[PDB]
Structure 1
Amino acid sequence: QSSRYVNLALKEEDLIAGGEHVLCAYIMKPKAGYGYVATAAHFAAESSTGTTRGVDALVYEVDEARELTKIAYPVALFDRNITDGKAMIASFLTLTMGNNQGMGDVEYAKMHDFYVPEAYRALFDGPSVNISALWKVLGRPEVDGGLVVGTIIKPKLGLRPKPFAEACHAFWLGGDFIKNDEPQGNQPFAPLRDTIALVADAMRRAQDETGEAKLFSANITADDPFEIIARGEYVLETFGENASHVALLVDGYVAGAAAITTARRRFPDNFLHYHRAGHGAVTSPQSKRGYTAFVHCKMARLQGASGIHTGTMSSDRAIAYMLTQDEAQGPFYRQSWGGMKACTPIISGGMNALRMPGFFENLGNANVILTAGGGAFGHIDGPVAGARSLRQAWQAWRDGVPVLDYAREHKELARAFESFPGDADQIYPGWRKALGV
């Protein structure tokens, strides 16, 4: 304790520059009455060695008031593969937020950020492919290729194989990407093999009447990796030609990191779509327990997700940057990735075509995947035209064209104006004037 796991004269800058320590930031409160630096010596020790050769997890800073504890964890602490040489997220959480999360002399404790040094960062998988792979299928520039418009298949469950394939076919006449909702698997009333053979078919017909390549994200989530692998393999070989048009969804939260690592290493040539199925209590309203969505997501790039459900509503734009850039500033630490492929944000929502440009402007790009509600798709003409206006709104954004001038020569974007006339004045006044009328 105290003199053992507390070294408050440590410059965080030295530590970063040393490159031998992982640093963590938490917002923990010592139970009723307990010393502030004493508890943090204790939370450090339980995290560290129990009962000093740089095996000790030092407390380089505390901010009694703000309830801010920063701890430096030597990189040698962290387990590594016997096989690979490779680091693991399982170790990382075990040390960092393992049953230090269960103590009895700490009200609550939540990790807010973490720094990973080069020696350590580099032993991790990182993403194998991203949006970039999606773009190249879609015949877009692999660098800054833009917006990929998607839905989820509402209802979430209860559609037989054909109804389901037909919902897919239908949607792909406007849109680019469909993704199996969260529990869609191998229910008795709509078997995986029957559905995925049918859905395979719907791609062919959609592609052929459209002339555009279409995208599908199939969950292969399962308890057993060989089952996860079983699916990966039956899906990719049933899409055959269109094997590279399939993304593999794995509910990484609710099935653990071994599930995420199974697809990542098994199928490294396909987009690994990480569902954030239901963080809740951990990544929350400020569940004073576990970690935040910033950290959950930052952790996934290191793990190897290609894309991950990220945000709708300091922000999920901060998360976005940390995930996609080579240098990103988090709430407490600035991180470099020394050329580690980015993980594509998958925004959920449904802006609409007139609000779409707004989104892209604050973010600074449109290199996301949008899994829009059947709401973002609402239009007076429909979801085929709803989805087309979304596409149309990216091109005018991209190209620099005033939307309204572009709308004039673009039907569905034009008909959108009128589809949400309430938002048009607000955002863009005189639209009718320019013609809508």
Structure 2
Amino acid sequence: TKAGAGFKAGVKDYRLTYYTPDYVVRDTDILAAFRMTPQPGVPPEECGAAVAAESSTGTWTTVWTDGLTSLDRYKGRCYDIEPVPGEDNQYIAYVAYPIDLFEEGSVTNMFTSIVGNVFGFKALRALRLEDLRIPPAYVKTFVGPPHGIQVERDKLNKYGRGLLGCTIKPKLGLSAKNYGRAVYECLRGGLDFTKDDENVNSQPFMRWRDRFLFVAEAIYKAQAETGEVKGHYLNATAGTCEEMMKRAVCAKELGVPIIMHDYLTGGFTANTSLAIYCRDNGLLLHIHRAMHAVIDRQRNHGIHFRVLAKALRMSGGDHLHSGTVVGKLEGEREVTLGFVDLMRDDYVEKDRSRGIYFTQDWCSMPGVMPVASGGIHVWHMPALVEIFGDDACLQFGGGTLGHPWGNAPGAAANRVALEACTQARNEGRDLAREGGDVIRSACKWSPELAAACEVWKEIKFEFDTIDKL
């Protein structure tokens, strides 16, 4: 009649329950890789165990209610800790989370556990979530993207080259009718798409429904003129889900092909709802990642963009901005190639040289089209085609509306540059070595391209990278 393990009140180390280095991960576990910087005097095992505990089942002192359930079944487990080379106080802590911890189909819930409270613990100095292994059994609980790359190309009837888009400029301050005027002139010159700026929602200078109607006129005029399917990402981003849905409904009722949403500033709950609406009504959904660099820029703290991209894939989006590598916003090449594969492909093997900490199996969830946008122009075209291949949308806002001859010629310049690079690649030319030659030849041929070539010839964006592997 000896006593079994009972309730003992008081504080004990988290590592006694949550550091389990001999744990064999299950194929349904959600895995996290945390770059962890402990405070002085806090062992890495204890820090990793605290992160595991406080993102799963545990708090700061022993609770009696553990005994009513099975902590073995539910606890998050720090199962491995690696030193970070180059770093004397950074570790990669690996945490396994049983699939029962998560609400089916809810990115919101998954983030709330894994990143909800642990980043603020006094016992750590910095914490960065680098990667998540989303198992097939959890992937299958999500609707995911409304359409995905193959369906999108099939609906648009567009094959054999990158898609081309363009953000209308000035960001803010244009009227609805000037917005449509700019859109028509852009689309008619050869761009597949234009878009509302991420912060163009509904404002005193331009109310949303006015914009949607004039943009519809522009889409249909440019489509009739060119014979190519056109779209403009009309922004459904709003202050409330009711306003977001009213905007999506208006796009549906105008018969236009594509809307956009700012998934992080609007939020995952609203994004997932909008993605389901877009699936149910046949709208393409472009996702803008506004605010991501608040979270993902610094190497020591936050969440890497690859996790934000996985989360968007799950919540749902047909497009997601991927960065450009060569443009005005940061994105290192290898980092970017890694998360582009995580966005598009069905099965991505572990590859630490591209920041892929876990093998990821998407179990047939549609791929998300990467959108390369921001400070790019015609001379970047070879590099963009080389980096992304055909399954991407390349967007030129300033690179279209900054052309000296206006939007149609600006659009034509970009379309010619893209087609010339695509043709050259298909003919066997190496765009990484011959890209300048391809553009120079095309500039000599096309007057519209030549004007763009001259204006932006010396413009490059080359800075020290913060988000290094």
Task: Give the TM interval when normalised to the shorter protein.
Answer: 0.7 to 0.9
Contact 2:186 2:410 survives alignment (8 Å) = no
State the distance in 2 between where 1:2 and 1:119 align. Answer: 29
Contact 1:222 1:259 survives alignment (8 Å) = no
State the distance in 1 between where 2:439 and 2:94 align. Answer: 51
Question: Shift of the alpha carbon at 1:414?
Answer: 6.1
Structure 1 unmatched runs, 5+ = 81-86, 424-437
Residues 408 and 278 (structure 1), Cα distance of their counterparts in 2 relative to 1, 3 Å cut: closer
Question: Shift of the alpha carbon at 1:318?
Answer: 1.3
Question: Shift of the alpha carbon at 1:262?
Answer: 1.6
Aligned length: 403
Structure 2 unmatched runs, 5+ = 1-13, 64-70, 326-333, 350-354, 430-437, 459-469
Question: Shift of the alpha carbon at 1:381?
Answer: 4.8
State the distance in 2 between where 1:188 and 1:408 align. Answer: 41
Structure 1 residue matching 2:450: 3-state secondary structure: helix
**Residues 152-191 of structure 1 mapped to structure 2, 5 A cutoff:** 152-174=167-189, 175-191=191-207
Amino acid at match of 1:258: T
Q: Of residues 122, 127, 130 in structure 1, which corresponds to 2:145?
A: 127
Contact 1:23 1:73 survives alignment (8 Å) = yes
Give the alignment's TM-score, normalised by structure 1: 0.85
State the distance in 1 between where 2:449 and 2:201 align. Answer: 39
Structure 1 residue matching 2:246: 3-state secondary structure: helix
Amino acid at match of 2:361: S
Residues 290 and 354 (structure 1), Cα distance of their counterparts in 2 relative to 1, 3 Å cut: closer
| Residue 146 of structure 1 pairs with residue 161 of structure 2 | yes
Contact 1:182 1:251 survives alignment (8 Å) = yes
Q: Of residues 108, 116, 122 in structure 2, which corresponds to 1:104?
A: 122
State the distance in 1 between where 2:55 and 2:41 align. Answer: 22
State the distance in 2 between where 1:252 and 1:40 align. Answer: 30
Question: Shift of the alpha carbon at 1:232?
Answer: 0.5
State the distance in 2 between where 1:4 and 1:165 align. Answer: 61
Partner of residue 312, structure 1? 324
Residues 404 and 227 (structure 1), Cα distance of their counterparts in 2 relative to 1, 3 Å cut: closer
Contact 2:444 2:450 survives alignment (8 Å) = no
State the distance in 1 between where 2:403 and 2:422 align. Answer: 22
Partner of residue 293, structure 2? 280
Contact 1:59 1:71 survives alignment (8 Å) = yes
Amino acid at match of 1:158: G
| Residue 200 of structure 1 pairs with residue 216 of structure 2 | yes
Question: Shift of the alpha carbon at 1:186?
Answer: 2.1
Structure 2 residue matching 1:315: 3-state secondary structure: helix
State the distance in 2 between where 1:248 and 1:107 align. Answer: 41
Partner of residue 384, structure 2? 359
Question: Shift of the alpha carbon at 1:392?
Answer: 2.4
Partner of residue 103, structure 2? 79
Question: Shift of the alpha carbon at 1:56?
Answer: 1.3
| Residue 227 of structure 1 pairs with residue 236 of structure 2 | no
| Residue 387 of structure 1 pairs with residue 414 of structure 2 | no
Structure 2 residue matching 1:285: 3-state secondary structure: coil
Question: Shift of the alpha carbon at 1:347?
Answer: 0.6
Contact 2:236 2:244 survives alignment (8 Å) = yes
Residues 99 and 266 (structure 1), Cα distance of their counterparts in 2 relative to 1, 3 Å cut: same
For residues 301-330 of structure 1, the C-alpha deviation after alignment (integer angstroms, 9 at most, x for no partner) is: 111111111112242121111111111245
State the distance in 1 between where 2:138 and 2:392 align. Answer: 28
Question: Shift of the alpha carbon at 1:121?
Answer: 1.8
For residues 81-118 of structure 1, the C-alpha deviation after alignment (integer angstroms, 9 at most, x for no partner) is: xxxxxx31111111111111221211111100010112
| Residue 31 of structure 1 pairs with residue 31 of structure 2 | no
For residues 209-234 of structure 1, the C-alpha deviation after alignment (integer angstroms, 9 at most, x for no partner) is: 22222111011112322221111011
Structure 2 residue matching 1:71: 3-state secondary structure: strand
State the distance in 2 between where 1:404 and 1:154 align. Answer: 25
Partner of residue 7, structure 2? none
State the distance in 2 between where 1:181 and 1:41 align. Answer: 43
Partner of residue 271, structure 1? 284
Partner of residue 450, structure 2? 415
Structure 1 residue matching 2:264: 3-state secondary structure: coil
Contact 1:219 1:250 survives alignment (8 Å) = yes
Identify, as 1 or 2, the structure richer in helix.
2
Partner of residue 106, structure 2? 88
Amino acid at match of 1:196: F
Question: Shift of the alpha carbon at 1:275?
Answer: 1.2
Amino acid at match of 2:409: A
Question: Shift of the alpha carbon at 1:383?
Answer: 4.0
State the distance in 2 between where 1:185 and 1:89 align. Answer: 24
State the distance in 1 between where 2:443 and 2:311 align. Answer: 45
**Residues 64-75 of structure 1 mapped to structure 2, 5 A cutoff:** 64=83, 65=88, 66-75=90-99
Question: Shift of the alpha carbon at 1:353?
Answer: 3.5
Residues 252 and 413 (structure 1), Cα distance of their counterparts in 2 relative to 1, 3 Å cut: same
Residues 188 and 350 (structure 1), Cα distance of their counterparts in 2 relative to 1, 3 Å cut: closer
Contact 2:421 2:439 survives alignment (8 Å) = no
Sequence identity, in percent? 29
Contact 1:161 1:198 survives alignment (8 Å) = yes
Structure 2 residue matching 1:101: 3-state secondary structure: helix
CA RMSD of aligned residues (A): 2.5
For residues 341-378 of structure 1, the C-alpha deviation after alignment (integer angstroms, 9 at most, x for no partner) is: 10111111354334312322233x12111221323665
Question: Shift of the alpha carbon at 1:289?
Answer: 3.3
Contact 1:353 1:413 survives alignment (8 Å) = no
Question: Shift of the alpha carbon at 1:406?
Answer: 7.3
Structure 2 residue matching 1:113: 3-state secondary structure: strand
**Residues 326-337 of structure 1 mapped to structure 2, 5 A cutoff:** 326-329=346-349, 330-337=355-362
State the distance in 1 between where 2:448 and 2:408 align. Answer: 12
Amino acid at match of 2:43: G
State the distance in 1 between where 2:451 and 2:162 align. Answer: 18
Partner of residue 261, structure 2? 250
Contact 2:251 2:259 survives alignment (8 Å) = no
Q: Of residues 303, 319, 342 in structure 2, which corresponds to 1:322?
A: 342
State the distance in 2 between where 1:230 and 1:378 align. Answer: 33
| Residue 371 of structure 1 pairs with residue 381 of structure 2 | no
Q: Of residues 44, 56, 67 in structure 1, which corresponds to 2:75?
A: 56
Contact 2:165 2:395 survives alignment (8 Å) = yes
